[PDB]
Subunit: 275 residues, 3 copies
């Protein structure tokens, strides 16, 4: 029995039940969304996560396999920290942290045969190994004064249930495999330098990647799918997306309004420069 | 016979044609998008509809069934009301209304067997009962002056044809059942108070829920779907979306420009407080 | 053989491999995104492409066929023109052009029998004719001074490989046929008038249509798909999308802060105009 086998557990006139048991190297990555409120620059609106794609190409045992991964988080906890109600105090109205109560989702896909026309799957299971994820060092760029830095945080990701999912994008749509992960706090705790907060567990959402190009976890997955016996059929992969056109229109109207306001402000600033 | 049947009208090696006939509780909900123009606060750029998700769990005859319902509208008319060309008159560039010519779409999904691998359907039919949808009281927060309140509006939703649809979201992707509703205006009219507009029919797009948690309508549906004979196959549902990255980029450039402008304004206002 | 044949190359009980050989009239259209930076109005942020939907209805040989097309571009080159660092020089931070190294994707879909339940396709091939896409005239509306006009640009689209794709939209989701096009630069060049740039091949991303309703190209396609034997099955087409709720929330917060800032500004002008 090989490591990357391909079996036919049944075969009808057109369709066929095939079994696929294959090793994988999930090279995934987080991505953070920072939002800085207006005013002076001491007030932050949100620091959250975003579903983060990463496509790559790794070597199997003599095969070059192109892969595609997409990470995300759910059930994260929304902490806050307000030093006061003034324009000059450092305040973060909301930032997200990962803990036991939350879960981490990783969608995975490859260019192998297991995924080409995978729409039905059963007997799905996987044996993944646990890893560690440490937070980064994010220096809050303040307009004037000292520079606080969010530094620390370490959480171990433990394997959990496996399912299917779909990785939609502006280029491709993939019927993908969804590995779930639970969390356990570790000794390195995250804290903001020059602040009265420290020794609290979790992983920050400012810079989870720690500057790493990716986090890597090895695995194996076994399943049984329905594929056409003729191995020439192809399911649609690429996309041409035009979703949220109302949102595009709202953004256009907001751009028009902000351009008119900036033109008004610039004219009122320039009239005083004619002496 | 049964009220929640599952019949086998045909069967082959791997596939099969199953007939499902089930009662359901369509608990849907409207949602509004109130955009307020800049300036002083007397001018409103648009008040539109937005497709509204709502997920719940209700009790069948000894079963606890999880469900998910997405409401939308189509063919809604656009009314407008301008009281003057000044910054100090209450003007609504556009507000959306529902009438006979328009239609209301409701995509419905449950965790039961009928929807687990539904990609093909025929002999689709449905028996739905009519309900009433009424508008609440949306008080326009005018900085100064009186307080216009958009109030009233009632419409009768009558059943129409049923079809298929796909509910996409940032979490789940659901091959769902699309119930369609036609409208007949009722006696209660919608009106903005302290304003020269009244005795016009439809539904206000401001507070269509009337402060309610949902609008419930019972129903029953019958169909014939193609399912793998092995009742263990699962179709991808969950997602991790990264759509409209270019839109996110434009929003980020907008936010940076807006923060720079706000910093300029705040420095200009702060320089005049040094005595 | 008819120009719009439909043949059966294999038929089991529930499924059947149906061959289709049909003529099509792809009428597509570019769409441009223009983001103008703030300040006076002398700096433009981006002039890029946006995937563009276009639905039409044309006449087959005694039949009326509704269609849906979606044009996109990949691998475009990012040029830019900056003539000075001052707020009064005309600058364009980044604008897109198309050349040999780029490709033009066109997703196509019809209401015909070929696209009713198409999820699997083999033996795909098509005979498409080549056309010429010519850019138009975009007048950069500067606040004051002269009015440069980006005028010209011609490029010939030639047939290339064919694949599948999925057209996602806020109304319909279509399992569609993806036609590729490669580019050969033509003689008419595009040049910004009243500027030091001219005689550079490609197509401009401001007005590609040249005031046209669409770009027409006729073709023929030939495939073999899996269709249930019963000609009554239907695959979900319509949608009800609520994706990017986080983006909607960001936009709402941005609109709130922008209204607050415009209110503060107009209040400063009212107190400075209340003597």
């Amino acid at each position: 029995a090989q490591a990357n086998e391909d079996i036919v557990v049944s075969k009808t006139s057109l369709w066929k039940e095939m079994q696929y048991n294959r090793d994988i190297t999930i090279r995934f990555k987080f991505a953070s969304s920072i939002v800085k409120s207006g005013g002076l620059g001491y007030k932050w609106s949100e620091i959250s996560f975003k579903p983060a794609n990463y496509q790559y190409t790794y070597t199997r045992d003599g095969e070059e396999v192109t892969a595609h991964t997409t990470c995300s988080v759910n059930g994260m906890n929304d902490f806050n920290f307000n030093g006061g109600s003034l324009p000059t105090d450092f305040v973060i109205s909301r930032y997200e942290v990962i803990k036991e109560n939350s879960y981490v989702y990783v969608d995975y896909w490859d260019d192998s045969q297991a995924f080409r026309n995978m729409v039905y799957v059963r007997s799905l299971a996987a044996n993944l190994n646990s890893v560690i994820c440490t937070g980064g060092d994010y220096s809050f760029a303040l307009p004037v004064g000292q520079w606080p830095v969010m530094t620390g945080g370490a959480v171990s990701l433990h394997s959990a249930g496996v399912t299917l999912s779909t990785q939609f994008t502006d280029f491709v749509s993939l019927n993908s495999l969804r590995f779930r992960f639970r969390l356990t706090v570790e000794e390195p705790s995250f804290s903001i330098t020059r602040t009265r907060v420290s020794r609290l567990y979790g992983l920050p959402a400012a810079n989870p990647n720690n500057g790493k190009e990716y986090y890597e976890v090895a695995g194996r997955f076994s399943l049984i799918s329905l594929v056409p016996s003729n191995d020439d059929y192809q399911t649609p992969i690429t996309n041409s997306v035009t979703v949220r056109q109302d949102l595009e229109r709202q953004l256009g109207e907001l751009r028009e309004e902000f351009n008119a306001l900036s033109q008004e402000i610039a004219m009122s600033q320039l009239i005083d420069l004619a002496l």
